[PDB]
């Protein structure tokens, strides 16, 4: 896949005490055209993980399917295990990295978030097999707009309530929606706590244009 | 006529002889005993020597940092199954960054030893295993046959005169669940002892011990670390 | 990188510099550029260090099998022909490798120069590397087939000293080996700053 | 026989293939397993024999998940059972990739019969010494229960049994009605049948393994909770005394 | 292309009861001539010649790999080869290597053994049967030889008069080309006898 | 599933026979009788086509298959093994026509088919074909008649029989055959020499007759055969 | 009936391997004693004529510059294992740049020693098991070691072992002469004394091969005058 | 692919197929070899089987290279397979190593090549033994004998084929260093040993010699007849001057 | 088109004493002009006497480590011993070379103790090949650390000074020093500095803050 087709843009991720939050536009673009105006770029992966993916949506439909099959096939044995998030995040690095040696890269950036064993986990994966954990993640254009707001907040209060995180992500989608060309009004927030994987549906973002009356030339 | 020349011939009685005969290889071998508590799994195997000049042959194989096996049977075959397990557990660490679940490792050996038992001109592996393992669900003992079955055990023993060892394990099955470490190992020795003639008993050259625990990766105790667990035993009753 | 090697009446001198560069930046200047293949074949590095170290070392694993199966040391002529045939399958892949198998034989001193391009020539003098052209000069005005073992050490030090003084990718210290018919001995390892105060005045 | 049974590749002068019939006996030497299809799901009952106090109870299963919405209950040589269960798993994962939904049970039955049949035609192999039953619920097709034997034949069933006492338990299922009960009602009658056909004079003890798959669990296959298993064993000891 | 790399020219010209085929002989490496005698016409059983112009390597392989497929067909069956077949056998040996072609253009010039009906056809380098009844050419002097034949040909010639025409039309065609010349040879097949005359030409 | 057996099942006996090819011939000689008459003008292939009832259809199957536009087969032996050779021959013919742009000569098509039959007496796990072929054809101005045996050899005849009572038919032909017979008159001779072995009345459904003159091989339609049986044309 | 090469006997052991074990009981006799000062390997170069050149039938080989090997049985099979070991210690030295411990080279040739496949196998796999016994005796980092290796593909470390056609009579005579204080010079004489009983030829400076491996030296095979020097004392 | 076990162990500890292949050798035509100190000599029995034969196809003494000759006995068909695959080996080793093959090395390879067929699927073990003779690069004579087992030993004198047990004994009583002193005295020792087994001689003794750094020379029948006349002029005074 | 490599910075540093071997590094994992994360050690303990640094393409750093740790486990299963330093170094080369025509883009530095108990360092090219040094800087700020540091350890171009061996305390304070000065002028170094000391007592882990700019 040396050229993507329909891509999603940006995926925010932040840690908080008892879970993680993921965000992402519901938009899939094909050039400048915004061709598919309602897609889910976040998928539930068993009870303690979920993935948000930017980049080519077609390579994502294909993880969505192999990663799903790889989970079903875990629960048939019934032996109680299930994969951590820390496992699903490794397993993906190895897939990218091996599609990079054959030169058929999966053109995605991935955010695996999950909460297991009283521990939050936030994973990133590149189409090269760069991979790491961190308290904050953002992919694509979020790496330069939202990342500085998420990170500023965590270098002066390294914990967060589930209510300060919700707000930290709705303040960062607004900034993304202003300055990023391929963004969309409607976006999804996914939240993994110890109660499971909840996918809040199409939230909107209220804006303001007070500055449309200050340009006069 | 005869139905014992291939693994690919059923018998008019609904039994396959070439898989029964594999079973005799496991009883021709040396006795071994394994049991589990709730935090510790322990293998003790009765090493056996050829003469007074030769050294004793090794019956406990380190597989990973939480697995271990004790063979019994043809040893050539026992290292084809050891290299195939080492390879499953250096493969999972490589792909998932986690150790393989013991029960899952026995599933892979169950598939792979089934194949040659249904394929002309092959034969089943003449080696029975005892797998000691500790993961998230505590400890486990498994027992594999050359039939390709397996059983999740509470405590087992295979090899020569293991009928006797199983008797001792069916009389003290209650204590095990709540023993401390030293007491568990001593149980397994008393059971392993009953496999010999009353004309001898365990020394430091007959026994090796393999422990895998909650905080303790699989370890092997050779010939001079067997003294702490071999001492503090009473003498076998006449 | 500047190796040079010549045979004379008492054996073969092999002399090297020691610098090795990442291009413009001197990575390490302690590189031993004479590869003890056996206890009786020297080799040299002069192309890419990766490429020589590996293929070179692999010629050792070949020559030790040969020596156990046939129960006799392997010719120099022969060892060079293993190393041409290994590297000739990767022609065009972009290996560099300017090696000089050098030893002692059932035909006296033997010196071959094997390339990665597929050359295999026996000679009497050679120089391989980036300073090789500077070595040929000063080496060939002093070289004769008959010398003393003390003339020859002093011709080779001098002819590496002059290469590392014109050229830029040569420097470090001058290793110096001497293959006698019982095995090679490590003669000297003089630095090039030291040699500078012995020759100037 | 003399040459009429060494190979799977030899018809008898009758027309029978003794190597396929010999595999049938390996099913007759294994304990019983029964399957009963109600009107909103399936229930699987396995008479797993406890042979020592050395085995961990609740292990050495004979109830598998071939897929998240399919049960398999086996009888016969277990080694082959664990071989079939991986060919199915493989097949039903395969189907979900190329067609993008769950594989209908009628179909999975045929694919696994195919694969069993191919092992009765060659010298390189012996037939499987293993019979089994596939059970699945959907909300768009109903409850279904197929049963495949070494021959490779599949049939639909309303109730089915396999193992050493297949004759006795088929009768006790025919007295039972089933086309009108829910799962909650059947599960007790399954346990009851098992206790009647089992011998505690031929076997030390036994453990009763029960499986939903029906409207209760939402089409998923799962074992029966410990609570409803204790009740179904208690209701079977009382009807056994009477 | 890489078939001007050795020059070459072949011309075959159908008479009335006879067929002539002529080539030049200059084997050279671009400009530098190596030798002046180098056969571009091969016999394929009597009364049937195949000429090959172009890259000298595929000249010799096609002529050697065609003798190996013809001899094995002329033994396994007893019938001697018929010229209309030999064409399709050659079309199939070029097209066997569609991708990565041969750089030769065959010119087949024979009489039917069972009868005597004359027959000529050329082939594109990938294998095309181009049967005419006038005259065929292949080579690097293609344009020049077409000119000369289109004006000197006549529908019916005796075998002495044919040889005058092919000669005239081969000497003047090859003289106006750089990479050909150095003398031409000319077979002229009749029913009874095969004459082989070499023309005096430019050793320019 | 099996890779196949590799060892041959045809094998020499201490006397020097290839016992399997010996038995294949006895399958042939049990088959439906068939005769061939080359008429120095054309070839005629006739064979009996008797059924076990009135239930069958006669326009389903035939025993005179065309291979090219001037090469026909008939056989006796095993109808299955015959349908295999027919198919292989047609691919050989076409393969040949693809490379030389001529239609396969009949001398050629007998060696090629023969070799395939030969190959199955020296490969693994297979038995020989229980068939013999009559391969007529009209190439190069003449006619041709050949006969391929399960062995893998062939012979060029001017008349012959095979199948049932071929010892009776072969001597009936050795007497009643005169070179330079007409093509029409050969047809009378064919059905005639097929009448000795045959049992029961002849009809247009019982015999398949197929000619082969410079116009090309063909079957005779049931109508033409009704005027040869009568003999009223 | 006929049974392939993979068939268990109702006993419990493989037919073919049971017979490979009898194939040794025809072979030469080799006695290796392992001490604290080195391993010595002695064997009998069974000649058959005086025409035969006694110096070209050796049955001690150098596997590396620290691992001798003495085989007895079908010497023709041996040349396939030995070659595979030399390749093995070398490969090992090509990757890790150290010597192979004598235990690990024994293990690599024992995997090869059991794997033959009538059907379902490569075209180059072996049709039958190897008919050899080996005595690897090197010195490495655990001090001197000696390993016995049998055609069953199993290996047990030793102290003093005899293989071949006179294993029983030599093995009993070893148990009475071997103690842990034995030195390398006392061991060489103990070898030739026990070898001189069981040879139905005679002890002679061309009828034996003697080779040591010592912690301070490489594998060194005794020439013909160093054999004569130890036959004076016997 | 025809994969089968052909060679398998006897329950007795033998190996039937190789015991049998050494029966095939024993049916073959005797061959003998002695190494001089500057001459090595092969002589093979029976070259006359008609007056209709060609004398270039009946050979049983071939050249692998210029250092190396090879006589054999046993199945003449199998031998022409080994001889060839050796010849190829002789150049492959002249390419990669500059020195020519030595005689130990070309044998080691013929040995191992017979041994492969004694332990691979489908194959029947070669049915020949061999006498390989040659001069090393240093100029010493070497004689070898291979077996269908895949084993080999150097020899000084040897014999394979029918009546090798008789000849072996003859060569133990007649080979010292008072026989073998000059080149012509070695050739006679070979002929005296063959004449024990053959009925006529000088008409069945095919004989070939190789000396120092010259190539093989097959002796025409007149050179062999002269030497067989020398044996009858010696048989007169080896009994009349001893009486 | 598609680049199979990207640069990710990271610097590693290794000083071989005569009783200790220090392996240092920054933890900043940058890509392009943003800072992906601030906490990613470039140091991975292997056995008890061996550390390895990996800098360069964090995609291959990560793979290459799991390949060492998997033939390192493989060796202890076949030979029944722990793998020495000089063994790993020789092995790492054969792995790197195995992909010569699409290489690992990794600078490696193995520090540890040989069998005399003294310090040993091995530096690598990306394509294989290693020598035995007493100090090697690697990675992005290799040219900041080489000229200074290699003066203080080796005493090059000095005159009339004492060639005193390196104390465990004189080095540690050196490492912390050179890094503080390379994180001022080089943009791929900072955030924090992870030192690994390898003596025969175990492996200590320090951490010091660098410039977060």
Swiss-Prot record, chain B:
| Segment forming the signal sequence | none
Q: Please list the residues annotated as glycosylated.
A: 107
Its induction note reads: Induced in breast cancer tissue (at protein level). Up-regulated in liver tumor tissues.
**Molecular function in Gene Ontology:** lipopolysaccharide binding
Predominant location category: cytoplasm
Which of UniProt's keywords are assigned here? Acetylation, Cytoplasm, Glycoprotein, Immunity, Isopeptide bond, Nucleus, Phosphoprotein, Proteasome, Ubl conjugation
Covalent crosslink: Glycyl lysine isopeptide (Lys-Gly) (interchain with G-Cter in ubiquitin): 112, 205
Phosphoserine modified-residue sites: 107, 174
Please provide one cellular component term from the Gene Ontology annotations of this protein: cytoplasm
Write out the function statement from the record: Component of the 20S core proteasome complex involved in the proteolytic degradation of most intracellular proteins. This complex plays numerous essential roles within the cell by associating with different regulatory particles. Associated with two 19S regulatory particles, forms the 26S proteasome and thus participates in the ATP-dependent degradation of ubiquitinated proteins.
Assembly: The 26S proteasome consists of a 20S proteasome core and two 19S regulatory subunits. The 20S proteasome core is a barrel-shaped complex made of 28 subunits that are arranged in four stacked rings. The two outer rings are each formed by seven alpha subunits, and the two inner rings are formed by seven beta subunits. The proteolytic activity is exerted by three beta-subunits PSMB5, PSMB6 and PSMB7. Interacts with NOTCH3. Interacts with ZFAND1.
The Swiss-Prot or TrEMBL record describes its family as follows: Belongs to the peptidase T1A family.
Identify the PANTHER family for this entry: PROTEASOME SUBUNIT ALPHA/BETA
Q: What name has this protein been given in UniProt?
A: Proteasome subunit alpha type-1
- Which organism is the protein's source? Homo sapiens
What is the name of the gene encoding this protein? PSMA1
Swiss-Prot record, chain D:
Triggers of expression: Down-regulated by antioxidants BO-653 and probucol. Up-regulated by bacterial lipopolysaccharides (LPS) and TNF.
What's this protein's name? Proteasome subunit alpha type-3
Q: Does the keyword Metal-binding apply?
A: no
The organism named in the record is Homo sapiens
Report the PANTHER family cross-referenced here.
Answer: PROTEASOME SUBUNIT ALPHA/BETA
Its gene is PSMA3
Predominant location category: cytoplasm
For the modification N6-acetyllysine, the affected residues are 53, 202, 226
- PROSITE patterns, A to Z: PROTEASOME_ALPHA_1, PROTEASOME_ALPHA_2
Q: Could you cite one Gene Ontology molecular function of this protein? A: ubiquitin protein ligase binding
Q: Which SUPFAM superfamilies match?
A: N-terminal nucleophile aminohydrolases (Ntn hydrolases)
What family does this belong to?
Belongs to the peptidase T1A family.
GO biological processes: proteasome-mediated ubiquitin-dependent protein catabolic process
Annotated Gene Ontology cellular components are: cytoplasm; cytosol; extracellular exosome; nucleoplasm; nucleus; proteasome complex; proteasome core complex; proteasome core complex, alpha-subunit complex
**Can you say where in the cell this protein is located?**
Cytoplasm; Nucleus
Q: What SMART domains does this protein's entry cite?
A: Proteasome_A_N
Q: Which segment of the chain is annotated as a signal peptide?
A: none
On subunit structure and binding partners, the annotation says: The 26S proteasome consists of a 20S proteasome core and two 19S regulatory subunits. The 20S proteasome core is a barrel-shaped complex made of 28 subunits that are arranged in four stacked rings. The two outer rings are each formed by seven alpha subunits, and the two inner rings are formed by seven beta subunits. The proteolytic activity is exerted by three beta-subunits PSMB5, PSMB6 and PSMB7. Interacts with AURKB. Interacts with CDKN1A. Interacts with MDM2 and RB1. Interacts with the C-terminus of TBXA2R isoform 2. Interacts with DNAJB2. (Microbial infection) Interacts with HIV-1 Tat protein.
UniProtKB/Swiss-Prot annotation, chain G:
* Location relative to the cell: Cytoplasm; Nucleus
GO terms under biological process: proteasome-mediated ubiquitin-dependent protein catabolic process
Instruction: List UniProt keywords, sorted A-Z.
Output: Acetylation, Cytoplasm, Glycoprotein, Nucleus, Phosphoprotein, Proteasome
What induces this protein's gene, according to its Swiss-Prot or TrEMBL record? Up-regulated in colon cancer cell lines. Up-regulated in fetal Down syndrome (DS) brain (at protein level). May be the target of the transcriptional activator NFE2L2.
The cysteines joined by S-S bonds are: none
Q: Which residues carry this modification: Phosphoserine?
A: 9, 49, 56
The positions flagged as glycosylation sites are 191
Q: Give all Phosphothreonine modified positions.
A: 48
**Keyword Nucleus among UniProt keywords:** yes
Which InterPro entries does the entry link to?
A: Ntn_hydrolases_N, Proteasome_alpha, Proteasome_alpha-type, Proteasome_alpha_type_5, Proteasome_asu_N, Proteasome_sua/b
* Pfam families xref list: Proteasome, Proteasome_A_N
Q: Does the keyword Membrane apply?
A: no
Quaternary structure? Answer: The 26S proteasome consists of a 20S proteasome core and two 19S regulatory subunits. The 20S proteasome core is a barrel-shaped complex made of 28 subunits that are arranged in four stacked rings. The two outer rings are each formed by seven alpha subunits, and the two inner rings are formed by seven beta subunits. The proteolytic activity is exerted by three beta-subunits PSMB5, PSMB6 and PSMB7. PSMA5 interacts directly with the PSMG1-PSMG2 heterodimer which promotes 20S proteasome assembly.
The entry assigns this protein to a family as follows: Belongs to the peptidase T1A family.
Protein name as it appears in the record: Proteasome subunit alpha type-5
Query: What organism is the protein native to?
Result: Homo sapiens
The encoding gene: PSMA5
Curated annotation (Swiss-Prot), chain I:
**What are the alphabetically sorted keywords of the record?**
Acetylation, Cytoplasm, Deafness, Glycoprotein, Host-virus interaction, Intellectual disability, Nucleus, Phosphoprotein, Proteasome
Question: Could you name the Gene Ontology cellular component terms for this entry?
Answer: cytoplasm; cytosol; extracellular exosome; extracellular region; ficolin-1-rich granule lumen; nucleoplasm; nucleus; proteasome complex
What the entry lists under SUPFAM superfamilies is as follows: N-terminal nucleophile aminohydrolases (Ntn hydrolases)
- Cellular location of this protein? Cytoplasm; Nucleus
Residues carrying Phosphoserine = 34, 40, 134
Q: Which GO terms describe its biological process?
A: proteasome-mediated ubiquitin-dependent protein catabolic process; proteolysis involved in protein catabolic process
Which residues are annotated with the PTM Phosphotyrosine? 122
Its principal location? cytoplasm
Q: Which residues carry this modification: N6-acetyllysine?
A: 176
Point out the glycosylated residues in this chain: 30, 181
Q: Which InterPro entries does this UniProt record tie to the protein?
A: Ntn_hydrolases_N, Proteasome_bsu_CS, Proteasome_sua/b, Proteasome_suB-type
Superkingdom as given in the UniProt entry = Eukaryota
Q: Could you tell me what this protein does?
A: Non-catalytic component of the 20S core proteasome complex involved in the proteolytic degradation of most intracellular proteins. This complex plays numerous essential roles within the cell by associating with different regulatory particles. Associated with two 19S regulatory particles, forms the 26S proteasome and thus participates in the ATP-dependent degradation of ubiquitinated proteins.
Q: Per the similarity annotation, which family is this?
A: Belongs to the peptidase T1B family.
Return the PANTHER family for the record. Answer: METALLOPROTEASE TLDD, PROTEASOME SUBUNIT BETA TYPE-1
Q: What is this protein called?
A: Proteasome subunit beta type-1
Q: Where is the organism placed in the taxonomic lineage, from the top?
A: Eukaryota, Metazoa, Chordata, Craniata, Vertebrata
Q: What's the gene?
A: PSMB1
